Every structure is written in structure tokens, then in C-alpha cells.
Amino acid sequence: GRRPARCYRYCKNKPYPKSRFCRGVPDAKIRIFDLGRKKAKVDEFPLGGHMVSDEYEQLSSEALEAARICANKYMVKSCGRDGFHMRVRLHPFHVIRINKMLSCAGADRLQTGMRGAFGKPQGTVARVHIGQVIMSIRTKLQNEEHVIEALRRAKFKFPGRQKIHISKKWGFTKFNADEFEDMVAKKCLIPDGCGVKYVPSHGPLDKWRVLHS
Amino acid sequence: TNTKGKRRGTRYMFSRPFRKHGVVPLATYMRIYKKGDIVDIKGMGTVQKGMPHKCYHGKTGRVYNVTQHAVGIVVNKQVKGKILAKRINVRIEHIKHSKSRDSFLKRVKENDQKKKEAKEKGTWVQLKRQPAPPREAHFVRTNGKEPELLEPIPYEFMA
Amino acid sequence: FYVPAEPKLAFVIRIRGINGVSPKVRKVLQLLRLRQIFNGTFVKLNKASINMLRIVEPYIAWGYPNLKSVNELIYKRGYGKINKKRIALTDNALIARSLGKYGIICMEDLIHEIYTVGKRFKEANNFLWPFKLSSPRGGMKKKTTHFVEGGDAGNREDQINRLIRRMN
Amino acid sequence: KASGTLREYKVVGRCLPTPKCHTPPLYRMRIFAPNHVVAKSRFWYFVSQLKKMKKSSGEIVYCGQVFEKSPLRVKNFGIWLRYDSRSGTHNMYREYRDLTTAGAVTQCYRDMGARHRARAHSIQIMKVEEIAASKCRRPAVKQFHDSKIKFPLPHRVLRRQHKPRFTTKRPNTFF
RNA sequence: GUUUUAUCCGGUAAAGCGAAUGAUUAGAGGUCUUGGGGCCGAAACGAUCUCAACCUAUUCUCAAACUUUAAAUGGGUAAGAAGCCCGGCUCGCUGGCGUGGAGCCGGGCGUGGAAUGCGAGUGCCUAGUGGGCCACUUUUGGUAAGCAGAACUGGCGCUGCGGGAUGAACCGAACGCCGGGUUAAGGCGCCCGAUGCCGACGCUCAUCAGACCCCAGAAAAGGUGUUGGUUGAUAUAGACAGCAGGACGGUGGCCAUGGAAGUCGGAAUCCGCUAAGGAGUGUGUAACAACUCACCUGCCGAAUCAACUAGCCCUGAAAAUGGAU
RNA sequence: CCUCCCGUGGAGCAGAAGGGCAAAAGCUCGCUUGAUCUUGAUUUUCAGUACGAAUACAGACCGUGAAAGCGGGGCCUCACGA
RNA sequence: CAUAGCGACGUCGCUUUUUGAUCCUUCGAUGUCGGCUCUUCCUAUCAUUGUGAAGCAGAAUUCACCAAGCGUUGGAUUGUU
RNA sequence: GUCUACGGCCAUACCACCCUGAACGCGCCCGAUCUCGUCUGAUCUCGGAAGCUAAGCAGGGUCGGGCCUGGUUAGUACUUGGAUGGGAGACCGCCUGGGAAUACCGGGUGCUGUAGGCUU
Ligand SMILES: [Mg+2]
Ligand SMILES: [Mg+2]
Ligand SMILES: [Mg+2]
Ligand SMILES: [Mg+2]
Ligand SMILES: [Mg+2]
Ligand SMILES: [Mg+2]
Ligand SMILES: [Mg+2]
Ligand SMILES: [Mg+2]
Ligand SMILES: [Mg+2]
Ligand SMILES: [Mg+2]
Ligand SMILES: [Mg+2]
Ligand SMILES: [Mg+2]
Ligand SMILES: [Mg+2]
Ligand SMILES: [Mg+2]
Ligand SMILES: [Mg+2]
Ligand SMILES: [Mg+2]
Ligand SMILES: [Mg+2]
Ligand SMILES: [Mg+2]
Ligand SMILES: [Mg+2]
Ligand SMILES: [Mg+2]
Ligand SMILES: [Mg+2]
Ligand SMILES: [Mg+2]
Ligand SMILES: [Mg+2]
Ligand SMILES: [Mg+2]
Ligand SMILES: [Mg+2]
Ligand SMILES: [Mg+2]
Ligand SMILES: [Mg+2]
Ligand SMILES: [Mg+2]
């Protein structure tokens, strides 16, 4: 029912989002993008490991769903259901089309060949660049090998080449792990849920004195 | 297969800049345009009357006729392998004085003054502007400071 | 550190042929009077001429000639454009009758005005027919790439003299 | 960048003075290049990467060859470099033995081309340093640190295979 | 069919979405409501617990028909004698004004007001053509096409010659008839001109090796083949590998049961003995049992181990007449 | 329905979309017929032919406004015929 | 008991024995289906030879390797493939 | 040092809140006979001058939002021209020139024309 992904591997078209011009798009295969203990605080999961593409290509929503399921199963097996938090960082926004031909023994049957060849929406894929992050897993610092193995197993659900990278940031934040603790101590960062709020040294002094109090 | 409407493809060309909509400032009306002076045709979209065609946006021409609200401009247009001097009527909202002509006439007046002054004081002076000459010989002092040694940095994957 | 003056004279040699040339490159080569492969011309260096050389960089090899290179080029292959004709410079009267009004009356004056880029450099240089040099004896490295990447095109600083010795 | 027998060049440059800093800083690099033209080009490449400089906005105040201060002494060279493979960029530390620093860098370029198919435009030499024989880490270099080194030349191949081209006697490989 | 110096023009590439318009992920903090409701609140949900919606500050990801910002390349104009500067005259237009504007008439100023190159201007008559195709790059439709359709330049058509064995288009170079010299792209075992150099350094063994733009065949995934490199770890307080032992007590630990006793599952990982021992890495017993592992020790006395990474080689790798670096 | 406050337009301008517009070009009133009579020039498609449409003028006769002014159809890009 | 034998979600290929897509050759013509006859070739091996594996006790079967030497039939219906 | 009238550029000028305002002025303010408009003398129009700076307005303030301008991001992204460069490709590196934009970190918070007043 679905064409091989090699037919839609490369970014050959302009982006074709689901909009008021592209109507009738079927839903993407991936609906859930965050798994594990999403409610875990920032300091709970210091280690962050990403899986990073090396090819400018298109990843299908079915491939993202399969990789998410595989990584979730391995992480639940190894670190337990509350010991990790995974975030898929690719959303299938690019609609791929199909010019369907009649798969019978006849070309006279109104096939028309390449006339009016613009196709109906086949599905959705995500566009990934060289260096872009596909999946992220944050967890305790001692589950580094489990994160690496989960991402390695998830790599097999994707066409191109991917690298595993243990990032230097603290968890899913954009701040370095070595500089995270002192920044929180001096209140440049305030935890809220899975992320932190950066508090710059500007604004009203009332927001400063609600801190330090 | 393209339409031939007068304003096809002018969606951004005739749109106003960001946060510069509304009333047209009155200095644009207060400008003075004589015959023979050089104007740039722009074509703002706030004023829909007397608009230039999109092929004259960004062009520069010479004023030959002045009316109550517009001017007549002789502007070169290239059509296939020939350039022809078109004459267009454009309201003054869509034009402004070209500063290249102003700078050139200021240079001419300054050069004439230089000729007069140099003929008064005898000594010759250079008027033709020369292109950027090669740099001349000079000494670069170290000031007792050894130049900093630079080496390429090792690769690391960032994000 | 003493930084010398940037060289004000260049020798430009056209190293690629006349087949399949983009219009801008073709126009700039015609303006440099390099309408044939292995044609050489003295170019006075400024911003305009340097940018013109940058346009036609893949098609030329150029550099900074020295006094010996100027002497060899003018004496062995020097031809004047007298009455639109390519006349060999076998006498000083041929130079005097065309350039005497500028104070240039001999081969030495022509060489001086070319080497030290003088007031009448444009007249003295346009008097000279573009030099028709032979193939480089000993071969080139690679005419299709730049000099800095192992080839022959573009600006070699003062190795143009090594090129000239083999070229004429 | 092609090659040959590379030479070391000390290249010193600086930005052109502007009415923002009348005396911009001077920067010095060691460039291993076939000649001074390529050396200046590589200097501009590297300082464009490191600082925010261009050949047009700056100038080169010095470019002089650096002669080896002891070409009659065998010494160990460690070279820190980085290069682009077919599938990424890697940092390498390699060791060689040579009389000259430039000869060691040439050995490095040939060895990278031989072992990793790395062309010279992919390789960025970032540090060259003479190292003590106790600081060496590569066993192929360390095995020559013998005060009583001794080896024969076992199987000496005839190289004059065409003078004579035809002969009655078969060659000897033992000497 | 050019640059330079001035001066405008633009909304593409990129970027942005804690900026508008659309799309979209997740938590966090607040408190109103036809949200569910909530366990003891009817009684004034006496209460305040949860989930909604909403708001606020954040957060993940996007746009050919979105955008604050915004290139490179690009398009226009100017770089004087038809100019500049003095007087004067005409006007039925304009008008407080001898105003303004335009025109006209005299006169004076050449350092000829960037670079470079080139000799230009102009008229008449006019054939053939009006099926095109190809390549780099940009690009639309299509799974794709030696497919269909555009932009830019060059080419083939109209074109031979040197190289790619061969070839409309690739690379070099364009051509009167010749002699000598030298090259390009490409080559120099032999075919076949030229390495018959005492060429340099490495890599590689293929029982389908490999061998040069277009180009004429391959992928994911693997290898304890070999070669380099990165990070980490152990080791004379004796590593590693081999050979030989211990591998418990409570506890045949709890909830699982028809036996699961460490190992058909769910939770947590207690302590002492110390040389160590997981209330367990596996085999298994109907079940016990019996083995094994990670952990320590003994003998052994100098280095070793692991995970990656990427070069060549190998596996992956199957078609029809006998055959093609 | 009535009242206050906020409200850069997130409404409306006949219609498709895009542009434009706030004491506007929107809404409501008042007066009106410039949607009138004419000649040329010009722009758009372009061969620089036509039609259509449009822009700036000039000459009449009017409308409105205290007036400056604005108006010869519709805010602009289509709505047509030798 | 993942991997004796299988393989969801994904994903990489090969083939030209299917059918398409295209319209480069042929419209001053390349006789257009099937069968009969006859030869040769391929291997992605049904059997036979020699092996490896099994949830291979034997028997039978299944998976895989070297492998195309040799063989792969008689009939009812249908123009049939 | 300021204000008024008319402005030019149109946020460095806007927005929110707080403080101060001498003198002229600008305002608020008082009234409806006339002029003129309303459902309403609220607005508009007209005639004034008891009181007031409460508001408008002006100046200043806010680790203020915005806006303006710098640094960083970053010689990064992107890009003109080149190669018989790499790679099965996807794409990538180099040569030759040009070169950004967020986040983040600083500084600033109207300038000015004409005419006429006030300020010992
Ligand atoms: Mg298939
Ligand atoms: Mg497409
Ligand atoms: Mg060519
Ligand atoms: Mg020779
Ligand atoms: Mg556009
Ligand atoms: Mg974009
Ligand atoms: Mg948005
Ligand atoms: Mg046609
Ligand atoms: Mg085509
Ligand atoms: Mg033909
Ligand atoms: Mg031709
Ligand atoms: Mg030809
Ligand atoms: Mg040939
Ligand atoms: Mg071939
Ligand atoms: Mg080429
Ligand atoms: Mg010859
Ligand atoms: Mg050959
Ligand atoms: Mg031979
Ligand atoms: Mg192979
Ligand atoms: Mg009229
Ligand atoms: Mg109108
Ligand atoms: Mg066709
Ligand atoms: Mg026949
Ligand atoms: Mg026949
Ligand atoms: Mg087989
Ligand atoms: Mg046989
Ligand atoms: Mg602020
Ligand atoms: Mg570049």
C-alpha cells in the first residue's frame, strides 16, 4: 500500500506543507513525540544524548514512529519506565504526493499516462539537514551506555547515516552541563518542569526582589 | 501562460515598508522638479493614481514635462535587443531626486572653483579622480611586541 | 617590518583558448587585448584593472615582471602599432615618430616608461602590439586550475618571470 | 594545494589601519607550503578562519622561509592535525623521524595520502613539535631509539634491470 | 555583453517563529467558569483535591502561494564644452514682488574633469529560418526515465583536428598549402610515439582483485584480514590470557504457587564473614538438585584490555550466444 | 438594547486574490450628476499594429465645499469586440 | 527460546520471465497470438551427486552450500498463454 | 531654561505607572441672550473669566516593555567564478572574491525650522 521509501528519500521538491492549498492530507503516522517521565525536573535527568543526521534527506513519519517505538522499548527495558525522557525533534510537515496509475492489464483504460500528472497527497515526511537532531534522550548520568545502545538500535529504522552524540548541555536545556549548577546557584536559571527559565539582569527590580526572597 | 495584468507580480514591489504605512509625508509634494533633472522612479502603492508600470520601478530618467501633479520622464527601457527611450507620466509621489546627479554637479562646481583658485595661485592641481592606487611602501612597528602566533583549532562536534 | 610598495605593473598572459568563453570573460579579454592564447600584455595595476583581472582569472596567468623580463620582452618580441600595422621595433625612429611628443624616443625610454609606470604609460603601452609568445618550453603544470592549487591560472606573484623566460 | 618538498614559512600579517584602530595587532603563523605564493594564500585562509580578516581588508607584512636550526640531527616530530574524511572530520596525532621540520611535514602529507586517501586540501596542520625520544608514542618511531641499532638488508632487489636487458647470469639478492 | 567611483532599485538564498499570519510538541505557574467533579464536601463543594477550558512566562518543530531582518550575483543613472559662470531681452503662462518658469541674444572660461579598449554614424534592398537538441549550474511535474517543461552561458546542428579504445554534445583546441621548434588535454610494460628513471613514501592478496571527468554498473549492513587514529580502563600494592579453588549465612529473602528455592513473572538490593559472592549473568532440574557466570584468591612474572573511527581488501553481489580495465 | 474602558485596524471597502487606506479609501448624513461635450500626447500587450484598459494634460460646461481644492465613473490590478 | 524454522513496525537493494511510464529506431511494411518441431543458454536447484543445520531417535520433512552434468512425463476441458 | 501658533523628519518622539511645574501661555472652568448644532450647550458653536494645575500638557524617574544604534552570533549561514576535486549517491571539501539574521550582551530615549511670549 505504501511505496518504498527510496522513492521519496531525497529532498527534490520545495516544501509542501499541509495548508489551505494542500487539502486532503492523511494523518501522519507519528502522533506522540515525547515519552518517558516527561514531568521529570531539570536536575533529575542531567545527561542528554542526541542522534544526529549526516545526510540531507527526508525521513518518513512511519520511520519516525518505528524508531520512537524501538528506542522506547529498549529504554523501558534497560532504565525502567520512569528513568528516561525521549523527545523526537522532527515533525513530518512535508507532504509527498503520488500520481496513481491503474495496476491492471490496460493502458487504454483512461490511464492518460503523464497527462495531468500532479498527484494526490501520499503521505508526510520530515526534512532533516546535515547536523540536525532527530531524537533526544535525557536520563541519569549512569545510563549513558543504555542511551547509546537505544539510539544505535533506533538508527536501523532510518535510511541514511546517523551519528550518536552525548551533548555537553544539561538535559534538554541549551546551557552547558558544567556551567549549569553555578548558574542555578546564582539564580541565572530557575527550573520549571522539564526546562529552565533564563533570568537576565534586566527588567524591573520587583522581579529581582521576588527572587532572593 | 502568464496573465498580462498591469500589476501582476507587484505584491511586494508596490507594498509599503514595515511600519511606514498611512499618510504620505508632505516633503515629497514640496519637492521641486525642473525640466532636465534626473529622477528615480519608485512607485509607492499608497497613491494609486499616476502609478508607473512595474518595469519602471527602480529605473532612472530625465524630466521633460511638468504638470500640476505629475512629471513627464524620459526613461530608457530595454526590449529584446534594443533600448528605446520611453516617455511616461508619473505623479510626484512615485519619484525623487537622484543623488548621483547632485553629487556630480557639486563636484563640477568644486572643480571649477579649484581651477579658479589654482589659476589665481599659480600652482597646478589634480582634478581627474584616479582609481584606488596600489598601497605604498611603509614601515610596520612591532612596538616591542612579538606578533601573536595563530594555529587552527581542533575539530569537535557541537550540535 | 618594512612592507614594500604594492607592485604597480603586471604582465598578463592568456593561457586558455578561444572556444566556449562566457561573454563577460570574452569582453574583458578583448579589453586587455588578449584575443589569442599565449598573448601577453603589460597592465598597470589599480582597483579597476585588478577587478578586471579577477573576472578573467581562470583564463590568464599574470604576475609582476622584473626589469630583465621587461627588457627581454621589449627587445626580442617588441612590436609597435604604427598606422594600425604590426611593425617590428628595429629602429629608434619608429618609436620617436609615434611617441616623441611624449618624450619617448628610444627603446630605453619605452622600457623605462613600461617598468616605472610613468605619466604616459597608457600611450607607451598601447603603442606596443600585444606580445605573441611561444608555448612554454617545459610544459605547464595544469592550465585548468589556479596557481596556488598546483595549476597555472591566476596570480603568481613573481614567478611570472620564470614563466616568461620559458614562454619567449 | 599540491605539494613537492614543502618549506616552512613564517608569515606575519595584520588588518589595514582604520580610524577605529590605528595599530591593529600583528599575527604570525607557520605555513608549510611549496612556495611563498601558496604560503600567503594559506595564511589568508587560516586567519580568515580564526580571526575576522580578509586578504582585501588586511595585508601581509612578512613572509620568510624558516630554515631548520639543526638539519644535521635526527629528531622526532609530533604533528597534531585535523582532516576531513569521506564521512566526517577527525583530529590526529602522528609521529615521524626526520632531519627537517618541513621534511617531517612532507612525510606527514604523503603518509596521510597513503593511509587515509586524504588530499592536501583536506589536511589542516595545527601543531608541529620536536619531541624527546621518551615522549614518543608510535612504536614504528620508538623502535629506532636504540643506541646499538643493527639490522641487515635482507633481500636486495636488482634495480638495474635493463642495464643489461639481456644477460647470461641470474642476479644475486644476498649481499 | 568590462571594471572603478558615486547613487538609487529588489525580497531570492539564508534566517525568524520567547515578531505578525498560518502550522505545531511538551511540561510549568495562576485563578474565573453550564469542564468533568469530589473520595467524609448537599448543609455557605462546611472544605479543597484532581482533570479540563482560559491566561502568563517558557519550550520542540515548520512554510512555493508567511514574515521583522536580509545577502552574493543582478538592473537603472551619472562621471561636462549640448558643461560651468556672467550680463541682457521676450512671454498672451505664473504672479504681493524687479515673482517663478521657459525661451532667446551677447560674453568669458579646455587641467577635454575615472580605468581600459576600439574608428564611428546612417540608409536601402534582402535570402534562409520560424521541428531543434545537448552539458555545468538554477529549476517545475513525475517513483523514475537516453521522460516532459523553463532560466543562464556555452556547444552540436553548421565543425574538422589532439585525447576519452569506440561515440553529434565530454576535455584540449577551432582549420589556407608546408618546414622547424614547443605545448594543451591526455599519456609513456607491448599493441602504440613516449619513464630501458638504479624515481620517492606508504596501502593492498581478492577460489567474482583493482585500474582515471561525462561513462557505461551497485546499497544498507557486517569482518578477531590488515593499516592508521580517538576516547577510556587495568597493571611489580603484580595486570591480560591460561590452569586450580571459594562463589556463603540468615534466605528454600517478600507478592506471585500446583514446583519454582537466585534464574516461567512484580517490586525493591538487607546486613555480617571476609578473599569475595548478584537475596543473581546463563544452562537446567517436574521440582529439589547439579553446573556456569561477576567477585576474590592461588600458580604464572611484563605489559595489557575495551568501545569507537576510516583507508585498502573480503561478505552482502543472481540471467540468459562466448567476452571484455 | 443602553453605558463606560481597552482596542494599529485583528473590521469594512460589490465579487477571486494581492496591494492600499483611520478626524481614511470605511460608516452616516447633505447637496448633486465629472458615468457629460471635445482635440491631441502617453502607458500597458506590443511588431513598439489594433482593441480593451489606464495615466498626465489642454479647451468647454457643470457639481461640491467657506476655501484650498477634488471630480470627467467605481481605491488599484479583470469585467470585453474589426 | 528473538534469530531450528519464521519476521511486525521500519529500512537497503537486485531482476527485466509481469504490468505500466516514455515515444529514441521502424509507417516507399521487421508478417501480429497460441500450439507443434528443434537447438542452445541462464540459475533465483524440483530431482539426482557431495555436504552443513534442525524443534535431525529411525522414516519422512524442512533450512542452507558447492553445483545447471543429467532429467523434469502421459492425458480430460479450453484457440488459449 | 522653557512655552504658544504653524510645521519638517515621523517612536531616540510610542506605551504603562510615579514625582515635580516659578512666570507668560496652553488648558481645565462658568454660562446659553445672540451665531450654530444636538435625545442631551456632553461634543460643536457662541459670550465670558469665579476657581484650579486635579487632568491634558511640559520636564524628570523605572536593573520598565517597545523603538533606535552597536557587540556577539560569525568570516558562521548563504553565495559569483574554477577544477579530469572527493563520494555509489545524498552531498561535502578546496581555490577565487563577496558576506548575513535570531537568541544573548551593551549604550541611547527626539532633533529641528519660521513667527511670537515668559523667565533679574
Ligand atoms: Mg517492489
Ligand atoms: Mg519536483
Ligand atoms: Mg573547452
Ligand atoms: Mg623537449
Ligand atoms: Mg517573488
Ligand atoms: Mg528559506
Ligand atoms: Mg509564528
Ligand atoms: Mg516550435
Ligand atoms: Mg528536456
Ligand atoms: Mg538541420
Ligand atoms: Mg556557428
Ligand atoms: Mg568543433
Ligand atoms: Mg578523437
Ligand atoms: Mg571509454
Ligand atoms: Mg571546463
Ligand atoms: Mg609541426
Ligand atoms: Mg594510450
Ligand atoms: Mg614504444
Ligand atoms: Mg566489492
Ligand atoms: Mg477640465
Ligand atoms: Mg480611479
Ligand atoms: Mg520529445
Ligand atoms: Mg519483408
Ligand atoms: Mg524477416
Ligand atoms: Mg546458486
Ligand atoms: Mg552436455
Ligand atoms: Mg528598556
Ligand atoms: Mg567562498
Q: Which nucleotide is nearest to B12 (CA to C1')?
A: E11
Distance from Cα A155 to the centre of ligand 19, integer Å = 24
The answer to whether A159 and A6 are in contact (CB under 8 A) is yes
Q: Which residues of C touch B81 (CB under 8 A)?
A: none
Dihedral sign from CA coordinates of D161, D163, D169, D172: negative
Nearest to D25 by CA among C6, B145, C2, C4: B145
Report the alpha-carbon distance of residue D79 to residue D77 in Å, rounded.
Answer: 6
Say yes or no: C5 contacts chain D, CB-CB below 8 A.
no
Angle (CA) C150-C154-C157 rounded to 5° is 85
DSSP annotation of C128: B
Resolution in A: 2.7
CB within 8 Å of A201: residues ≥ 6 apart? none
Q: Which three cell numbers stand for residue C125?
A: 603601452
**DSSP track, A30-56:** ----EEE-TT--TTT--EEEEEEE-S-
Report the alpha-carbon distance of residue C83 to residue C79 in Å, rounded.
Answer: 12
Report the alpha-carbon distance of residue D9 to residue D65 in Å, rounded.
Answer: 4
Report the alpha-carbon distance of residue D130 to residue D24 in Å, rounded.
Answer: 32
Q: How many CB atoms lie within 10 A of CB B65?
A: 12
Question: What residue type is assigned to position A169 of the chain?
Answer: K
CB contact under 8 A, D28 and B154: no
Q: Is the CB of B73 under 7 A from strand F?
A: no
CB within 8 Å of A182: residues ≥ 6 apart? none
Q: State whether residue C168 is helix, strand or coil.
A: coil
Strand partners, C154: C61
Write the secondary structure of chain D as one string of H (helix), E (strand) and C (coil): CCCCCCEEEEEEEEECCECCECCCCEEEEEEEECCHHHHHHHHHHHHHHHCCCCCCCEEEEEEEECCCCCCCCCEEEEEEEEEEECCEEEEEEEEEEECCHHHHHHHHHHHHHHHHCCCHHHEEEEEEEEECCCCCCCHHHHCCCCCCCCCCCCCCCCCCCCCCCCCCCCCCCCC
The answer to whether D93 and D77 are in contact (CB under 8 A) is no
Q: How many CB atoms lie within 10 A of CB A85?
A: 23
Cβ-count burial D43-75 (b if 16+ within 10 Å, e if not) = bbbbbeeeeebeeeebbbbbbeeeebeeeeeeb
Q: Which three cell numbers stand for residue B88?
A: 511616461
CB contact under 8 A, C46 and B132: yes
Report the alpha-carbon distance of residue D15 to residue B105 in Å, rounded.
Answer: 36
Distance from Cα B67 to the centre of ligand 20, integer Å = 14
Report the alpha-carbon distance of residue D88 to residue D85 in Å, rounded.
Answer: 5
Place of cell 579589453: C31
Distance from Cα A31 to the centre of ligand 1, integer Å = 28
Chains in contact with A, where contact requires at least 3 CB pairs less than 8 Å apart: B, D
CB contact under 8 A, C150 and D61: no
Q: How many CB atoms lie within 10 A of CB C112?
A: 15
The answer to whether C96 and C105 are in contact (CB under 8 A) is yes
The answer to whether C1 and D61 are in contact (CB under 8 A) is yes
For residue A163, give the H/E element and its range. Answer: strand A162-166
Q: How many CB atoms lie within 10 A of CB C31?
A: 12
Cβ-count burial B113-139 (b if 16+ within 10 Å, e if not) = eeeeeeeeeeeeeeeeeeeeeeeeeee
Q: How was this structure determined?
A: cryo-EM
Report the alpha-carbon distance of residue A76 to residue A85 in Å, rounded.
Answer: 10
Distance from Cα C144 to the centre of ligand 17, integer Å = 22
Q: Is the CB of D84 under 7 A from strand H?
A: yes
Place of cell 613573481: C158
Place of cell 515525547: A34
Pick from B141, B147, B152: which is nearest to D12 by CB? B147
The alpha-carbon gap from B155 to the nearest alpha carbon of chain A, in Å, equals 14
Q: Is the CB of C18 under 7 A from strand H?
A: no
Cβ-count burial A154-168 (b if 16+ within 10 Å, e if not) = bbebbbeebebbebe
Report the alpha-carbon distance of residue D116 to residue D110 in Å, rounded.
Answer: 10
Q: Is the CB of A209 under 7 A from strand H?
A: no
What distances in angstroms separate CA D85 from CA A83, D89, D109, D116, D122, one per listed residue?
Answer: 37, 6, 14, 8, 8
How, if at all, do strands C154-155 and C60-63 pair?
Answer: parallel
How, if at all, do strands C39-44 and C9-14 pair?
Answer: antiparallel
DSSP annotation of C21: -
The answer to whether B36 and B63 are in contact (CB under 8 A) is yes
Pick from C2, C5, C49: which is nearest to B135 by CB? C5
Q: How many residues does chain D have?
A: 175
In strand G, the nucleotides that come within 7 Å of a protein beta carbon are: 9-13, 19-23
Alpha carbon B134 to its chain centroid, in Å, reads 28
Q: How many CB atoms lie within 10 A of CB D122?
A: 17
Q: Which residues of C touch D26 (CB under 8 A)?
A: 1
**DSSP track, B144-155:** T-PPEE--PPPP
Say yes or no: A17 contacts chain B, CB-CB below 8 A.
no
CB within 8 Å of D132: residues ≥ 6 apart? D76
In strand F, the nucleotides that come within 7 Å of a protein beta carbon are: 9, 18-23, 25, 41-45, 47-48, 55-58, 70-71, 75-78
